[PDB]
Structure formats: C-alpha cells, structure tokens
Amino acid sequence: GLREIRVHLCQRSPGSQGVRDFIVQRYVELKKAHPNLPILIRECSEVQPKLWARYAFGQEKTVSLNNLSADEVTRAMQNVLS
Amino acid sequence: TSVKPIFSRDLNEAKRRVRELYRAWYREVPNTVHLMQLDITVKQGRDKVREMFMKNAHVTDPRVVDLLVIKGKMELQETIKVWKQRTHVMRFFHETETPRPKDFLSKFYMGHDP
Amino acid sequence: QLITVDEKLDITTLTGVPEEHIKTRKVRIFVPARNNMQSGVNNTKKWKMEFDTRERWENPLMGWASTADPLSNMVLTFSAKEDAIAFAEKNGWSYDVEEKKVPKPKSKSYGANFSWNKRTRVSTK
Amino acid sequence: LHHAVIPHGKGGRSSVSGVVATVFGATGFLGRYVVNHLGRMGSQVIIPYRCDVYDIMHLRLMGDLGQLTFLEWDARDKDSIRKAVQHSNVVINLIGREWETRNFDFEDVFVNIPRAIAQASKEAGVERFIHVSHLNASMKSSSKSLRSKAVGEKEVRSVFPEAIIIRPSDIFGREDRFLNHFANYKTVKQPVYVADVSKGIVNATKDPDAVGKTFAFTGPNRYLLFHLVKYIFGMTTTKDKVERIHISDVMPTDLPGLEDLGVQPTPLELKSIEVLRRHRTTKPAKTVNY
Amino acid sequence: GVQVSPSGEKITHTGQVYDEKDYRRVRFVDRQKEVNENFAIDLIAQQPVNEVEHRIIACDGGGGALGHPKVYINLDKETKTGTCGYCGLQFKQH
Amino acid sequence: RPTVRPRSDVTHKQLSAFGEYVAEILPKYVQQVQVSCLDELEICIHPDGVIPTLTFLRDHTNAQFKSLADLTAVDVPTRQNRFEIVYNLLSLRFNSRIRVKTYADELTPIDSIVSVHIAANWYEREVWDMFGVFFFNHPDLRRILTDYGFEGHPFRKDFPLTGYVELRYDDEVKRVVAEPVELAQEFRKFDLNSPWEAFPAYRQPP
Amino acid sequence: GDVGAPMADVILPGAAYTEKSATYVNTEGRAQQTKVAVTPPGLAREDWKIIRALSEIAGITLPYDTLDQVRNRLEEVSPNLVRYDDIEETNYFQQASELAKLVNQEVLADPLVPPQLTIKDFYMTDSISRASQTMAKCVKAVT
C-alpha cells in the first residue's frame, strides 16, 4: 500500500545525471497518470541519489541511484510503483 | 602523526603497568576497610575498582594510559598512607544521591534532561 | 625515541569532567555578532566557543536565579576556527560551527545626493 | 497548581520539589531522616516543636536556606495547629511514645491528637495526610499502645478518608530503642531501616497511587528473637516495652508493601555493624519462617 | 501608604503581595513582614512646584556635592511642568 | 612628565646584549629572545633545554642567576602547545632578573629541575595539580593545594569557576558527602570588553 | 491559549521559539535554526519530545531520542533542512508549467485585495502579537 515517493538527488554531479534525465523525460506523464500520489522531488548538494518510497503503516525502502542511467532509473521507479 | 612518548612505547607495556597497578590496589583494598571503619564489603570495594578501571578501557594512547597510571598511583599513595579519610573514599559510591534515570520518559516527566 | 600514534586525540578521561557534562551537551563555535547599538568592530575579531543553555529557575526565598549547570558562564576565546574545533574534538564535545559573516564592500558617493537625473537625490542636507 | 509549587530544579539541596510538608514528630528518631529526605530535594518543611531550641538544631543544616520553618506549638493548644497545617499540601504525623507520662496517655497521643491534626488539615484544605503506626496494630493486643494505634487509624480515616496509613515493624538505626535497648545489658521478628521507611514516606508524598491505602514496611528477612539477640551480643525498663518485644511480627497478606513505593529493603546484616560498634569495648543469623 | 490585602498582608511601595493561595506566607507566621511606610511617590507629590523667571533652570538637589549631577531643564511648555529625572522636583516658567 | 613613567635605556641595552650573549652561547635550545618596554628580558626555549639553560644561568660566572623567584604555568587554549611554563630567576651579584619560558601540552611533559633549584619541589607539584602538567624525575608529585579525591585541573581555562561538585554534611550517613553543584544565585557573566580599539600599537592585521 | 485551546479536550503546553532549538525556513529555502535562550515556563516541554514520549506510551516507540537524530530524520525526508544558511538552486519550472497548463479553472470577478491594508493590521497577526500589551498601545495610537 504505497503512500508516498520521494526522490533525493543532486546537481552538477555524475551520480544524478540519470535522475535529471528521468525528471525531464518521465515525470509529467507519471503525475498525470497517478495525480493523487505525492512525488517529492528534493535536490541538494553532494549527496548520493536515493528513492525513499513510503508504504501504508510506517515503513519505507530506499535504493541508491548513483552512476545509474535514465532507463535504469525508470526501471527502478516502475519496480517500486509495482 | 609521530609523537614523543611517556613511560611506554606501546599499549602492551602500558597494559602491564596497568596490571601491576591493579595488583597493588586489589591487594591493598581490605586494609582500608579495616583501618578506617567503612561499612562496605571487600566485594563491593573490588567491584568498584574493576568498574573504575573499565571506565577507561576504550583508551588507546600509551600516553593517556601512563598518565592514568600515574594518577592511580597518586591515589593509592594517598590511601595506603592514611591521608584520605572515610569521607574521601566513600565519595566513590554516591550513597546520597539518585542518578539521572536512563529513560527518555523518566527524564521528560520531571525535567528538560536530554 | 619517537613513537607513532596516529589515532584521534582524546583527553576526556584526564579532564575529569563527567559523562553528563561531556556527552549530554552541545557546543557552539562562532563570532559574536556586532551590537547594532554600537559601530565598533573590535569584538568581531576573535572566535568564541560557548555551550547550550539550561534551566535557570527562581529561588523561593529571595527570587534569585538558580542553576545546576556549571558551564553556563563558560566562554572560550580563539584566534582560529581550526584551533577552536581541535579543542572541541580534543575535549569530546559535539559542536556546531558558524561562519564569519563579513559585511560587503559598498560604493559611497557624496555626490550622488545631488544628481540631476537619479533618485538618490536627497531632500534634506 | 500555583507557580510557587512547580518542581523546578535537578533534585538537589537548592532546588524546588513542590512539596510543602508540615511534619509533626521531627525532634525524634524517624523525623531526623524524614526531614533530611524532604529537604535534600528542595522541599518546604514546617516543623512544630515543643522542645527547647537546643534540641532542634540538628535539623537546621539538612535543608537549604529558607526551606525550614521552625515554630512552636502545644498539643493541648488548638489554634497552634492551624498555623502549621495551613500553607501546606502534605501533612505527616510521626508522634508516639514508648511509655506513658502524667499529662499524655496512649489514648491522647495516638487517638485524640492525630484526630485534631487531620481535622485541621481538612479544614485548611491540604491534599495529603500520612500517618504512621505499628505493624502489629490490633485491638487484641497485650500492649494497649497497639490498641490505641488501631483505634486512632480508624479515628483518622473517619475525618480524612483519603489518608495514608503506614505500618512498619521494629525499626533499627542509630539512636534507636531496639538494638540499643537489647545491647544495653516462639517470637519471630522482621525489622526495617529508618532509611527505607523515610524513603517510602517521602515517595508516597508525591506518588499518586498511595491515597486511601495502607502499607506494611517490613524487612527482607525474619529472625527468631533468640538468634537475633545472640547476634547482637556476638557483634558487640517498661512493661509495655517488654510486651511489644514479646510479640512476633505478622506476615501481612497482599497488603501494599515497601517495594510498591519503589524502595528496596536494606538487610540488617549490613547496618548492624555500623549501629553496634559504639557498644563495644562473626557469622550471620539463619533466616527462617516460623 | 501601606494598605492591607484580603489575606491581611501589607502592600509595599512596589505592589508585592503573596497571593492568598501562596505557601510562601509561612515565613511570616509568628513573625512580621518588614515594610517601609514612607512612600516617596507621595512624599515628593507633597512638595510644591518651583517657579522661575528663566526658561532654562539648573538642578543639583541642594549642596553642590551631596546632591546629584547638575542637570538643565527647559520650561518652554507652559502646558506641564519641568521635572528632574534625579530628584523628582518640578519647575515652572511663571 | 609627572603622570608618565620614566624610561631608562641603559637597562634595555644591557639586557639586549645579554640576550645576544645567551642566544649565541646556546643557539640550540633557544628561540624568541625579547626585551620589553619596561626593561624585562624573556628568553623562550625548547622543552629539551630546561636543565642546560638553568644550569648555565646559575653557574656561569657572568650570570650567577641563583634564586628561583618563581615557577608558573599559563593556559592559552588556542595554540597546540597550550601550557606556557615560566621560570622567573634572580641574580644578586648583578641585581638582575630574567624570565625563561618554554611550552607544553597534555601528554607532553617537562623535565624537572629539583637538581638545579630545590625550590621547585613544590612549585612543580602545584603546576601538576592546577594545570595538569607532568614532570619527569620528580621524587614526589601529588595533590598539594586541592582535596585528596579532587578530579580535575582547575586553573585551566575550560574548568568552570564554581566547579563540578559541592560538599555538605548529611545526618543519615554522618559524613561530609559530595554532590553536584546547585547554586541559589548563578554567577553573573558581565560582558565588558569594548567594541572600540584602545591600543593601535597592538592592532593585528586582518 | 488564544482560539483553539478553549475548544480543546486535552491541552499539552509547549515551548516558543525563544525556548527551543528548532529549524525554520524562509520563502527562499534558507534553513535556519534558533538557539535556546530561556527554558520553558513550568511544565512546558519541547514539542518533539512530547510527541516522542506520547508514541512511546502508546506503543509506537519512535526511533528519535535526540535532536541530532531528529535532524538526521529531517535529512532523510528532505536533505536541505540541515544545510543551514545555504540556498539550493532549482531547475524544473519547465516541467512545472508543462503540467500546470492542463488545469482548467476560471478566475472570478471580485478583485484581489490584500488583508493588510493599513499599519493598523500589521500588528496583531499571531497569538504572540495578540498577547502583547504593547501592540495594543500601537493599534490604539494609530486609530
């Protein structure tokens, strides 16, 4: 019972190039598909990108997206959402 | 980085100095409860020595260990020679104060103790 | 005659300070802000280390300010953030650090108060 | 709640504990510890006295500056008890003699005075009243002291239903009339320490699950009178006193005990050595159950 | 002047009284509450206004020393008086 | 002038010359010789030159610095070697005084000089008790001014003024027990230092 | 206690900003933190301590014991709330607007007036400014 997704990423670093690509490519489509889902884009400086996904009764998971490409990031995103 | 040492080259020699000091203390302990009429038992005294030794176990620096040995020797002198008193020795057990409870709730309920 | 000990430095077991006041604390390293009341800057030149404040209650007898923290009036002065932080680490205190907020250089032109075209023109001399 | 009561501090001499306690029976032997336990955490302590001011000087140093208030009274004099119960949240009664004088019978001491104390407390508007009695308190008793105690407990409850009775057993410490009485020169005893009793009372002074109840403060062990007196003599005149001596200690069933206030029994086998070395110029006693 | 409160306690020159529900009233039992009965806020009011023929007047309190620092007061505002911040006296311009 | 202090340069000359003298005799164990406005001579040295320099000054015929007026320590917690050590020395043959300074820290002791001056037997114990600084080859080294169970070095800059513990008599145990410190009037910290520079001669550069 | 406290069933006193270390954020994403100046009055406590103890009682014991742990939680949820004094750039307004362009909702006729027109309303905008007996002097003087 997923309740929230939150991507944490960086800028001007390789680790987050795939995540920026994902954001430009497929984020509007994801939102319009499931609009009532909270997707929290959160960028900072000198982090290692992660995707914290939070389920119903107070649990959540995470996966490092460092040195990952846009297609792999979309793979992990769909894995989580599924 | 590189340093200048004090009374030791490595933690092994430091630990053997420590063990000599523990021999001395452990052996002397009962003479104190005899000379000065303490209420506590030799078991309590020895447990206290062990506690005060293990309180500084994480230490790694031979110098920080040699200084603790020095200070323990000073204390043992003050004790075997009757310069300390019942008061100074019983200042180790804290018989007249309750400790800060190690419970978030027991703290919150009374004060801002974090 | 020299030894090598590269491990982090600690003197906590020699300071004699207790656990309650060596782990339950939070120290602050900063430069004291200038008092906007005065325009002197001979106080924003040395770094200072202070502690977190604690309970300060009222005596029932006379109304005075009573405490139990013996490090409430403890303030230390340093000439360098590196030395301040080294001392903090040495002693074993969790520290927050602030940066030296220096004012910006400003362009001043007494002639700007009399321009023929600009808004900087002043209405009272 | 009044801001003057909010317990600000860290539990120390110069702190505040929100405990305003009027204590009767401080010039004695158990008050000497009750007052210390009250004051060393920052409580206000009204002490009425009838003695001369010299016999009440061992109490001026056990509390911080301004927390102790010594005033005078007279049991027969009413309106000398309003003064003391007013301006308080807790009242503690520790009065009691081991004998009878001319002016004061056991009846008076244990029935008539506590009753007036509780009446004045209720009148004032205090919120806690603590009374101390004996473990063997019972109307069926060779000693009329215990008779009067078991009568006075009811005479108190009839005016202060939410009171708190505390029945300890033979108490042993320094300046006690039990071990020193034995060493001056069929029955099982379970004595208890003034430290434990005072800790219990001072805890009940705040604990919320103590009102309208009773407590049997007894030690951890039990001993046969003979083994205990022989232990005394190895470590080394009143009819009612001897009567209270020749009575065994009850094992009160399921009554809220000492470990329900948080205190823990301190065995006599640890403090006898400090209490008895004064009477000088060994193995322990076999604890038993009947 | 000292005027008593419901509880029966005298009020001070700064309005201090232990609330009737206050436990701190114990210290006064069998004792008293030390209070000053001479209120400056009234004793100075009892004094009259000085008059001067100059719009600026210097006050020191009396003796050159034994008084207070010489301060100068303006008397252009006939609506009110000119008060000294040290001694409380007040002057007028006539 | 009547409000300012006189100023003699003969002493400045003598002491600068003696500074050069001492420093060229001991180019080792020496650094930062300085003679000040008020005509006092300081010589800073390395912790390995204590006994050499003290012996030289005491015995050398030109120096005869016999009396150990004082031994002291000073805590500056902004420098890696935080414990300055100061020997104030006196010579009667010349009516002269000198200051010899070295440095130390925690875990980095100094050499004792009871062999040179026996007065130090107690000054060094006092330094160890107050600032926490060990000395090598000291016969007895133990608490001298503080209580027997005192844990701390109170003349440091980080040790609080009022301390960490406090004593009082408790009737229960019939002793003078120690406890945490709970004051009825917290010492007030007056911030006095002014924002306006008072001495430009000491103005540090930014 | 101004509006929501009287219409309450349980009331838990807490600590203001002069009485707690706590992060706030301004309109530009600059995270800043207060520093305790005066401990709270009486039984008042810190809000996160209150909620933590409440969960511990209920049986939902949280993992936050200290402020540093709560700050690491803030870091996990959003990593900007611990880079104090530092703003963080953003570059996704194109997507924001791409999406927002597909939101049909018509504006209305009534103008858009500001609630604060005269200085009379600058004062008394929060419970502290309603409690202040000086802001009242200023309002009265204005009127």
Ligand SMILES: NC(=O)C1=CN([C@@H]2O[C@H](COP(=O)(O)OP(=O)(O)OC[C@H]3O[C@@H](n4cnc5c(N)ncnc54)[C@H](OP(=O)(O)O)[C@@H]3O)[C@@H](O)[C@H]2O)C=CC1
């Ligand atoms: N120890 C025991 O064997 C047990 C004792 N208790 C209870 O312990 C309580 C105290 O024990 P203890 O401390 O030995 O009592 P103490 O005799 O030590 O002192 C008790 C106080 O009672 C006061 N007092 C006694 N009679 C009168 C009176 N007629 N008028 C005014 N004041 C009076 C005395 O005040 P002053 O000294 O000023 O005259 C005295 O300070 C007693 O109430 C007793 O019931 C209960 C169970 C066991």
Ligand SMILES: [Zn+2]
């Ligand atoms: Zn005047």
